[PDB]
Amino acid sequence: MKRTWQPNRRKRAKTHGFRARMRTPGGRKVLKRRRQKGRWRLTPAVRKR
Amino acid sequence: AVKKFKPYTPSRRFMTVADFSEITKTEPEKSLVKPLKKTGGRNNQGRITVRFRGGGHKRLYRIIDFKRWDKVGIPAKVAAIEYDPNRSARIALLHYVDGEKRYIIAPDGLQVGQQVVAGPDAPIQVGNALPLRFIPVGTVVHAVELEPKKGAKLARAAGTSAQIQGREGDYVILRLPSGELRKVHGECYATVGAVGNADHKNIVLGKAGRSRWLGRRPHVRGAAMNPVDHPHGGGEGRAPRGRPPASPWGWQTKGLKTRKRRKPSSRFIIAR
RNA sequence: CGCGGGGUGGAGCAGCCUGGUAGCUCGUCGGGCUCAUAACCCGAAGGUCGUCGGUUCAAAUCCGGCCCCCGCAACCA
RNA sequence: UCGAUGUCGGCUCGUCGCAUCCUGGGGCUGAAGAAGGUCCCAAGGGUUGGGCUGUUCGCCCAUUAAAGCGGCACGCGAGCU
RNA sequence: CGAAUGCCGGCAUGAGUAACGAUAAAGAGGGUGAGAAUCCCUCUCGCCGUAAGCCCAAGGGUUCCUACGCAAUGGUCGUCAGCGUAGGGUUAGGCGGGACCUAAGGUGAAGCCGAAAGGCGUAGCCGAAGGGCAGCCGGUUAAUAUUCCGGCCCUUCCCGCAGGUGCGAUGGGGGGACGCUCUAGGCUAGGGGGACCGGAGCCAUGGACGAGCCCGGCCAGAAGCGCAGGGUGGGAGGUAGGCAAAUCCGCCUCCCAACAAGCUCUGCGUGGUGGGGAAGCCCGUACGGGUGACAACCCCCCGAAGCCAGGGAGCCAAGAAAAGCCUCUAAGCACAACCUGCGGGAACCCGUACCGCAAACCGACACAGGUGGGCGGGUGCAAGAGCACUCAGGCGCGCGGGAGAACCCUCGCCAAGGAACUCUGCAAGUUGGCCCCGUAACUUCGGGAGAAGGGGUGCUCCCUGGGGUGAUGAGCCCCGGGGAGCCGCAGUGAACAGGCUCUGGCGACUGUUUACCAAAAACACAGCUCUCUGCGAACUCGUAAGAGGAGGUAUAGGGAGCGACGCUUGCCCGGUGCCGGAAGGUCAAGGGGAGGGGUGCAAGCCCCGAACCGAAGCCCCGGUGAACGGCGGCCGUAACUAUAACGGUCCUAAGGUAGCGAAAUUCCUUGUCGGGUAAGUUCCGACCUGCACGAAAAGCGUAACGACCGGAGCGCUGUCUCGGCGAGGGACCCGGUGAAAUUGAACUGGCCGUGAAGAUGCGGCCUACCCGUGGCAGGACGAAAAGACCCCGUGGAGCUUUACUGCAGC
RNA sequence: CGAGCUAGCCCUGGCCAGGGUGAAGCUGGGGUGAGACCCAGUGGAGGCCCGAACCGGUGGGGGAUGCAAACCCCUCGGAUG
RNA sequence: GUGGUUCGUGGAGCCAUGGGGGAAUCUGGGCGGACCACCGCCUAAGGCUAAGUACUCCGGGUGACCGAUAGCGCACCAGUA
RNA sequence: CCGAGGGUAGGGCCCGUGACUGGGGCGAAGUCGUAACAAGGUAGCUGUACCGGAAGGUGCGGCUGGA
RNA sequence: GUGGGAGAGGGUGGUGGAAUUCCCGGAGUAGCGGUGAAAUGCGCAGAUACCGGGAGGAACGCCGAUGGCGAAGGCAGCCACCUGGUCCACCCGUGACGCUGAGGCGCGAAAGCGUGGGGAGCAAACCGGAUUAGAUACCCGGGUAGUCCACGCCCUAAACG
Ligand SMILES: NC[C@@H]1O[C@H](O[C@H]2[C@@H](O)[C@H](O[C@@H]3[C@@H](O)[C@H](N)C[C@H](N)[C@H]3O[C@H]3O[C@H](CO)[C@@H](O)[C@H](O)[C@H]3N)O[C@@H]2CO)[C@H](N)[C@@H](O)[C@@H]1O
Ligand SMILES: [Mg+2]
Ligand SMILES: [Mg+2]
Ligand SMILES: [Mg+2]
Ligand SMILES: [Mg+2]
Ligand SMILES: [Mg+2]
Ligand SMILES: [Mg+2]
Ligand SMILES: [Mg+2]
Ligand SMILES: [Mg+2]
Ligand SMILES: [Mg+2]
Ligand SMILES: [Mg+2]
Ligand SMILES: [Mg+2]
Ligand SMILES: [Mg+2]
Ligand SMILES: [Mg+2]
Ligand SMILES: [Mg+2]
Ligand SMILES: [Mg+2]
Ligand SMILES: [Mg+2]
Ligand SMILES: [Mg+2]
Ligand SMILES: [Mg+2]
Ligand SMILES: [Mg+2]
Ligand SMILES: [Mg+2]
Ligand SMILES: [Mg+2]
Ligand SMILES: [Mg+2]
Ligand SMILES: [Mg+2]
Ligand SMILES: [Mg+2]
Ligand SMILES: [Mg+2]
Ligand SMILES: [Mg+2]
Ligand SMILES: [Mg+2]
Ligand SMILES: [Mg+2]
Ligand SMILES: [Mg+2]
Ligand SMILES: [Mg+2]
Ligand SMILES: [Mg+2]
Ligand SMILES: [Mg+2]
Ligand SMILES: [Mg+2]
Ligand SMILES: [Mg+2]
Ligand SMILES: [Mg+2]
Ligand SMILES: [Mg+2]
Ligand SMILES: [Mg+2]
Ligand SMILES: [Mg+2]
Ligand SMILES: [Mg+2]
Ligand SMILES: [Mg+2]
Ligand SMILES: [Mg+2]
Ligand SMILES: [Mg+2]
Ligand SMILES: [Mg+2]
Ligand SMILES: [Mg+2]
Ligand SMILES: [Mg+2]
Ligand SMILES: [Mg+2]
Ligand SMILES: [Mg+2]
Ligand SMILES: [Mg+2]
Ligand SMILES: [Mg+2]
Ligand SMILES: [Mg+2]
Ligand SMILES: [Mg+2]
Ligand SMILES: [Mg+2]
Ligand SMILES: [Mg+2]
Ligand SMILES: [Mg+2]
Ligand SMILES: [Mg+2]
Ligand SMILES: [Mg+2]
Ligand SMILES: [Mg+2]
Ligand SMILES: [Mg+2]
Ligand SMILES: [Mg+2]
Ligand SMILES: [Mg+2]
Ligand SMILES: [Mg+2]
Ligand SMILES: [Mg+2]
Ligand SMILES: [Mg+2]
Ligand SMILES: [Mg+2]
Ligand SMILES: [Mg+2]
Ligand SMILES: [Mg+2]
Ligand SMILES: [Mg+2]
Ligand SMILES: [Mg+2]
Ligand SMILES: [Mg+2]
Ligand SMILES: [Mg+2]
Ligand SMILES: [Mg+2]
Ligand SMILES: [Mg+2]
Ligand SMILES: [Mg+2]
Ligand SMILES: [Mg+2]
Ligand SMILES: [Mg+2]
Ligand SMILES: [Mg+2]
Ligand SMILES: [Mg+2]
Ligand SMILES: [Mg+2]
Ligand SMILES: [Mg+2]
Ligand SMILES: [Mg+2]
Ligand SMILES: [Mg+2]
Ligand SMILES: [Mg+2]
Ligand SMILES: [Mg+2]
Ligand SMILES: [Mg+2]
Ligand SMILES: [Mg+2]
Ligand SMILES: [Mg+2]
Ligand SMILES: [Mg+2]
Ligand SMILES: [Mg+2]
Ligand SMILES: [Mg+2]
Ligand SMILES: [Mg+2]
Ligand SMILES: [Mg+2]
């Protein structure tokens, strides 16, 4: 059947990107938490040009 | 007149379509004056706030003239009468000698080629606009302003009118389509005649689809729902209500008057 | 089986809960009116209060046990 | 037996008890014969096909030597429905 | 530490067990190799072929090409690989994206709002498979190419020279610019045919040296033409509108046009040049190379859904924006500038490999699932993207080999009987395409209808009739009709392709829903009715601002119910709701102080505090049922009995009318007649004693409609009597890889007892050499899930209201 | 933190072979005082019919440590809304 | 009308205060738990102000702290796979 | 080829029959009430419409076969 | 044909006042209504009665008749338009064109039906109050369809002279 993962680079970027997270206090805290944690990747890596 | 069909299909046996014979050879509209992009959307910034809206034909807005006092004294020739997707009435395309082209909402009896004009001057004829004062008591009228210089707001639906009843210092009394008795300021413009397309009420949609074409989504009964959804939801195999009939939001829907009492508008109203 | 409602002249109903007196209606009987009958009028009688028992100074009336009458319930399986 | 014993009826397969429906053996009979009634021995084998109902049962249809009762977790769902 | 269905780990059992992922299928010879069913090569075979073939987009991201490799990954093997090591490989002014535009939406200076964080928010900005925009055809690489190279062709920009003109904008206007369905003409794509032109070869096995078989007979292309079509009127005056201005546009007014004549713009045809070019055969490659060839490269036909495109015609639901483009002027500039022609010079950034219906994307897997767009050849079946076969192209689905038991899946066939099977004809059968006869009740006059039931269907020869395209003829192509005749069991000879009726229920109907057990009679629906709302509407979301409603205005918008259509919807307003009542009763804060207390020496200061004044709500008075709801008991009575039109009485707010009625409703019940049957708890018609119908939670009907539910009959069958044979895939045996839940340990028999009451394990007796293998499924209260019912717990949640208590709201 | 599954709405694009039946409306004829209306012919309507793609998920069987945490075979509904 | 305080409307002050009314400048004002007298204490409606105190990313010392199933999640290129 | 007739299939008229049901005819002395004939104690009749155990009543218009 | 006349003859548009009902204002107090008599009912929440104002619907008093017109059903305030029939004078033109009329076709009171509109009075149904033995009636107080209009149906009558 159709599963739940339907990859889209634009969506992944607009949805979970560094700039989206930065836009709101909710998201800014996510970066803070991930930084303090020592996460190698703050936001998902969306590729291609 | 109303177009009628033979039952060559079920739902074609009741279906019924407007007569478009008053639609003069001018079916597609007029750029310049109108159209605008019209912005379909069944809801506010976010959430739906009027249920069951959506779908249905794309539209172009015809930006019509609801304040006729710009062109006081300037007459215009009625050039055409065309279909307007965004109202029950039809609209008149008129050419002002000025050059300017406006649409007026098209009254019953309006003929193409006719002369029409607005102002204190203005022969009392179908199509003309006047401040309510100079209009003879008892004449039927439409596109009436509520307060002066604020635009036509009463009687624009197809086949509607108001009748002038009497006067009272600065106000003339109106009898509105609903039957209400209203004091409306003398200085309010209103155009003589009834609205026309009066056979609008006689049309039978005929099937579900037609409803959808006009963007009317299926309306579901409270009875059909559940207690979470509606006061009428549940219980077992059908149910008669079990309380005084209500809206989904709990207010009673048979009888409960809802106009706020202390409206300052009150001292200008005399009926139902 | 459990639940609670009734048994009052010939018929249908009051009366009880706040015991002490059984009343209304109809029908029955005698008298009248009419040529006559019905209607009307004037008068008149008729109830061991379902049946056993005590409760009491006294039970239609309060309390128990049976007697038929009516209405309710009888559910998860 | 609730850290589960699947619960009606049908179906397949059975198998047992006899307080025996049929067939064998009998006694009494208000047993002439034939046919019954009834009781006593006896389970070795038998114990049909349908209409209606989920039905068990039952009621009919047409036959029969007869159209037996009951147990086996209202036998049988790691066999079916 | 021994138990916590404990935690983490390791290793056992089941077990050499089930499996090895589509039943599209394989065999052999030769190579390589330490080692081959599996790797390369060849021959033969089978499978896709509106794909299982090629081209995009998304997503993936080294998976591409090559050398050397086989420990692992591959469901076996592997010399192979999408795997391991290394190296190479993606070339653009013209394709796509960006230095262009705007959509919903986002963002957002002005502005408004919010305890904060933040929420709105016109102008502008951002935002794309939408608008705008200049590249076609061939060649070379192991791997890239509309990117390189070849030929032919364009686009901007910047500086020049040459000629024209009032040039000039983010501002005006015009255009871009828009639906659906049906379409005409002329073409192109693609396809068929050819005695003609080009070709290696070919006569097989009885015949054919022949218009014989086989292969192939194009591609691109500026100008100028040619054909088809798209667009457009030209003058002059007046001008108060397009938010400054206008020579523009708009509105009047006259003349000329009414035509595509003329202007331009597309597409196609031709085009200077350029390019490709088969089968076969010989080569050594994994693959591509030469030869055929100096290839030929020509006529006929069919022909689009594609091109001309902003084409036309009808309809109602009435069909984006902005820029590029044309123009009009404004400031300003007019030694500037802009247009046209020519020259030279400038033209950046990112993507470009490969997979791409799948072994590289989404599903933990090399997964039988999912995944948008374009091409998708031929022949035959009426047609088509259907179906059968087959081009090109691509596969034989990464375990094999044997055997030929039960039993299972998938299939085929059956005497006689045809529903007896069964909860049901569940399933399976029959039927099946086209043409032609031929068709009922009913009906809203459409339909019912493919009603039913029928016949025709091939091939041969003769005669004969319309078109199409060609000239009016030839052919090639599409449709017809008539007449003889041949053959078979059988002619849509294979494949795709209704079983038909009758009568009830429910719902009108197409529609919609429980993604992953219910598709319905539930939802919706047109339509009907009630009720709210006069517009800063009611209603909804948000504290707000604000937005929806709606850029709507009572023929409009919200809420409820009912649900096409026909005939209809009775009576009760006592209770509850809703509505309407300047009276009255009651009523909080506050107004009011008659009056009483606390202090003080007093002036004072501080409390209590009754009259009466005080809203809405209630109470009370009214109305209202397509508002919540409701719509009776008993006793008698007719000249056969029976029965009760008739009466008496109690009670009510009023006591169910019509129309249905043992029902989707009927307990007693298989009610009672009647029909269908040999037989009928079901079905159909009736009676009515309606446990417990009933009129908009609508009542009684209704043609048509339905994967809805019930009953009946015909037709037909393996459903059955009642089985039997046959096929393929497994099962079984050999080689290879090889799991699982489960498991206190086990050396694990019957009966009769007994035991916590159903024993392999206790008692007595009975039987029983040790161990396996294919099978059946009675038992181990077998496995699986801390029972889903039940009850408990002062455990939890969703729900309702005249439970309490608050809160938003009014 | 989630509408990359799903539920609706908005904006922009796309897809729906091939047949059937043949409404209005025109056109001619008939009819009439003018009509209505009736005939053909044309016309090409429709939550219309058959049937692919495509969107479904009706009935049965299979599958059930599956190929699959919804699948496969036969069968069925819609397919210009 | 509320918060703060041991204070939950209590006899409820004091300190903060959203709403209404609304003074004085020392013979002025507040408080000393309703209030009033008396006796006392402070001087509101402007601000600033070390130190003693809290913490422990980071460096150092020390442990009747662990010693690779412990000790931080990580002794190991871990907020990695 | 035709063709008596036989078979399958579907329609047309007619007759018989049917639980049950509708109203109808006739049947000496059954119940109910009084509609009509006298102005019939509400003038009557009437088409239509609703309602009622029943004659009947009533609404609207009409008639004189009444005042 | 020529020239005249009477008419509630038909259709559409427009319009006048009287009266009833309701709302509003004034003034006004204890009953009004109704009948054979009563009661339901209306009214101190201010009725009836009177004044003034507004709204709306239907019907046109006097003239009016024993009258006029129409083929019938029918048709009545007033105005205009559109329009049918008809009588009279003259004897002007035609020149038998004549009468009836199966079917067909139109017309057709009232009540009723459809969709829309309107609704003042009245008024089937219905509810009450009296009268009755009962009264689903007569009388009384309410009241819905309807009566009114546009259009479409219906087609019957004591459509009677
Ligand atoms: N022939 C009379 C027709 O039927 C009806 O009349 C019938 C009934 O009304 C009538 O019934 C009458 C009754 O009215 C009257 N008051 C009492 C009488 N005993 C009855 O009588 C009836 O029954 C008896 C006995 O059985 C018979 O002998 C007698 O013939 C018969 N008429 O009997 C008639 C049938 O015979 C209509 N009313 C009348 O208009 C119609 O024309
Ligand atoms: Mg525009
Ligand atoms: Mg947002
Ligand atoms: Mg609904
Ligand atoms: Mg529900
Ligand atoms: Mg709720
Ligand atoms: Mg609720
Ligand atoms: Mg129910
Ligand atoms: Mg409810
Ligand atoms: Mg339960
Ligand atoms: Mg248990
Ligand atoms: Mg256990
Ligand atoms: Mg024995
Ligand atoms: Mg014997
Ligand atoms: Mg047995
Ligand atoms: Mg049993
Ligand atoms: Mg038992
Ligand atoms: Mg059992
Ligand atoms: Mg089972
Ligand atoms: Mg222990
Ligand atoms: Mg352990
Ligand atoms: Mg373990
Ligand atoms: Mg095993
Ligand atoms: Mg085995
Ligand atoms: Mg195996
Ligand atoms: Mg395999
Ligand atoms: Mg090797
Ligand atoms: Mg094939
Ligand atoms: Mg790699
Ligand atoms: Mg490779
Ligand atoms: Mg190699
Ligand atoms: Mg391997
Ligand atoms: Mg694998
Ligand atoms: Mg590699
Ligand atoms: Mg740049
Ligand atoms: Mg940009
Ligand atoms: Mg932009
Ligand atoms: Mg925008
Ligand atoms: Mg924002
Ligand atoms: Mg673009
Ligand atoms: Mg480009
Ligand atoms: Mg490649
Ligand atoms: Mg210029
Ligand atoms: Mg511009
Ligand atoms: Mg512009
Ligand atoms: Mg030979
Ligand atoms: Mg060319
Ligand atoms: Mg200007
Ligand atoms: Mg070559
Ligand atoms: Mg077009
Ligand atoms: Mg712009
Ligand atoms: Mg490339
Ligand atoms: Mg590529
Ligand atoms: Mg594809
Ligand atoms: Mg594989
Ligand atoms: Mg796959
Ligand atoms: Mg797909
Ligand atoms: Mg075909
Ligand atoms: Mg094709
Ligand atoms: Mg195919
Ligand atoms: Mg057989
Ligand atoms: Mg046979
Ligand atoms: Mg048969
Ligand atoms: Mg049977
Ligand atoms: Mg059986
Ligand atoms: Mg059946
Ligand atoms: Mg079947
Ligand atoms: Mg059926
Ligand atoms: Mg049916
Ligand atoms: Mg349905
Ligand atoms: Mg679905
Ligand atoms: Mg489901
Ligand atoms: Mg379905
Ligand atoms: Mg909101
Ligand atoms: Mg708004
Ligand atoms: Mg809006
Ligand atoms: Mg509405
Ligand atoms: Mg409903
Ligand atoms: Mg319903
Ligand atoms: Mg219904
Ligand atoms: Mg009702
Ligand atoms: Mg009530
Ligand atoms: Mg009430
Ligand atoms: Mg009331
Ligand atoms: Mg009230
Ligand atoms: Mg009050
Ligand atoms: Mg019954
Ligand atoms: Mg019932
Ligand atoms: Mg049968
Ligand atoms: Mg029977
Ligand atoms: Mg029977
Ligand atoms: Mg019901």
Ligand SMILES: [Mg+2]
């Ligand atoms: Mg109801």
Ligand SMILES: [Mg+2]
């Ligand atoms: Mg359906």
Ligand SMILES: [Mg+2]
């Ligand atoms: Mg079989």
Ligand SMILES: [Mg+2]
């Ligand atoms: Mg086999």
Ligand SMILES: [Mg+2]
């Ligand atoms: Mg093996």
Ligand SMILES: [Mg+2]
């Ligand atoms: Mg042993």
Ligand SMILES: [Mg+2]
């Ligand atoms: Mg035992």
Ligand SMILES: [Mg+2]
């Ligand atoms: Mg032992």
Ligand SMILES: [Mg+2]
């Ligand atoms: Mg033992």
Ligand SMILES: [Mg+2]
């Ligand atoms: Mg077992």
Ligand SMILES: [Mg+2]
């Ligand atoms: Mg078991």
Ligand SMILES: [Mg+2]
């Ligand atoms: Mg178990």
Ligand SMILES: [Mg+2]
């Ligand atoms: Mg438990």
Ligand SMILES: [Mg+2]
């Ligand atoms: Mg408790």
Ligand SMILES: [Mg+2]
């Ligand atoms: Mg036609």
Ligand SMILES: [Mg+2]
């Ligand atoms: Mg069509």
